[model samples]
Target: NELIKYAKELVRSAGKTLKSAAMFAKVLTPNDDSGRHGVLVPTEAYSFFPDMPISDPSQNATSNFPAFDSLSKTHKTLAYKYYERYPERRITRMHGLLNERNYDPRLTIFLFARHTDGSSGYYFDCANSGSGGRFEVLFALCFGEAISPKAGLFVVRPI
Candidate 1:
């Protein structure tokens, strides 16, 4: 509930910024699978590069552009695999990773809920509008909560 609201706010702000400038993912949306989702550049403000093959639950490295190692780490929750190397346990390995690394839970921007219907929803950060971050832009993407581990959210950032 709360987290969903927060994510909405963050995404709205991001959308506003994107309206002025350019955001690669704005083109990819709702059932569109053209694979022309634009380029994910490694360095800032430049787009000319080779496609980088990266691994996902359904597929493995299929690009030639530079892929971020950190993106791989975050997706390691195995939200993409069906058998669940992360397992369908009550607790997620991401929680352990955050705790093990001592990452502050306060940094959490949203809370996601899984329903019995096999779908998921989110609660975003609404309480703090000017939340502190070097993060210039933020976006909220939804997925089926019961998505076979390989179906986790995808984004690009520095390696």
Candidate 2:
């Protein structure tokens, strides 16, 4: 409870400089029967390139990624709870690519989370914002917790 409150406070302030911006992501794994694909992209402003595919829990990758199954119990609990309310969806990984219209040049924050069932995903937000949005909710969910080795929160500096 206290942790949740503390997290809310930090995101509330830190998200002030963040705003919705134009961004892109590349579809890694090809769409399954349902058309969903694994997503991957470089978050740095200079290299929004797709460097490597994000590995599925069942596959091995040469690059590092959030290992959903290995996350701490605290992060899993919070992520599971959130997924319970929103329900996970398998959309095309590249569907949101090129959706950004006002791309910023500063650091960007990425929030990665996983479901109880091993399905994991992530969202991105700019470091500078004028109002709080999804980022605030994510910060609240993972508040005061270490989310390494499972899910993660990363800040990509502009290169």
Candidate 3:
């Protein structure tokens, strides 16, 4: 559909822009989190989730948006497949040099857009049992609900 195509292009552009910025940030010491090993921490950081105005500080640490339910079944199915196939790495806890805000979400958006049909997924939930709080990524066809239009979707998995 034309809508999906438009969304894909938008994400693709955003992703590239984010990566360009993140790549410029100096790389710091490498650290290990959970079973994952040798992940680089950059001096600059960017949050991988939408920055909505939250009344509670606790909520700010995690995404305030609910799981996106607007995606088509086909889109949802693909996201589920990517979820199963992609290896997850927690960037928040392992990288001491990294800050929450410096973690670039745009790069993430670009990668997801490049890989799939522009549905970079949504924040389903998070778990703190591992190295860092683990966030789940699910496909959301539209960004009007659950997340603000300006916010970019964040993924914790290492690029």
Candidate 4:
């Protein structure tokens, strides 16, 4: 039932869930006690679930994001530099990086908007795990989210 390669599906699901939760937000309370909980089935699920082939450390690491030199063949050079920048962190971890603001929610799609190849998009919580703690309806419009088709409307959320 896990569709790792179908990130579009995840984005769509998140949109629907976002609408529903927002509708009855007052009646419901969310808890994200642990930051580990994410909207798209948490990074932990993708990291562990075996059916999600794209989530596999071997394939996903090298496809879009940077990877450790020891893990990826294509990113050996970039990965090395990435490693040097953040010696304790891997390339994939860079996806969670923010600009001047640390721990800020960034839209992955927006950051890589110019590199859109149909697969780029934002991440939202569609629904999963206990509807508490990590139950908060969170959103981040990164690379893809920034350049998405908008009907001549510009919106910005003050950070």
The local distance difference test score of model 4 is: 0.22
Backbone clashes in model 3, listed as residue pairs: 15-110, 45-101, 45-102, 45-103, 46-101, 46-102, 46-103, 48-154, 122-138
Q: Candidate 3 lDDT, tens digit per residue, 20-102?
A: 11111111222322113322222122343234333543332222222222211112211110011222212322222223333
- Candidate 4: where are CA atoms >4 Å away? 1-9, 13-87, 92-97, 100-136, 139-159
Each prediction's whole-model lDDT (CA): 0.25, 0.28, 0.26, 0.22
Off by over 4 Å in 1: 1-5, 16-79, 84-100, 103-159
lDDT of 2 by residue, 19-120 (tens): 222222221222211122222232342233223443453343333333111111111111110112222222222223223323221122333333334443
| TM-score for candidate 2, residues paired by index | 0.22
Q: Per-residue lDDT of 1-159 in model 1, one digit per residue for the tens?
A: 432443334333332211111122211122222122211222331232222323444433232221111212221221211222432111112222222212111111233333334533322221111335211223333222343212123322211
TM-score of 4: 0.18
RMSD of 3: 16.3
Superior candidate under TM-score, 1 versus 3: 3
Among the numbered candidates, top TM-score falls to 2
Misplaced by over 4 Å in model 2 are 1-105, 127-159
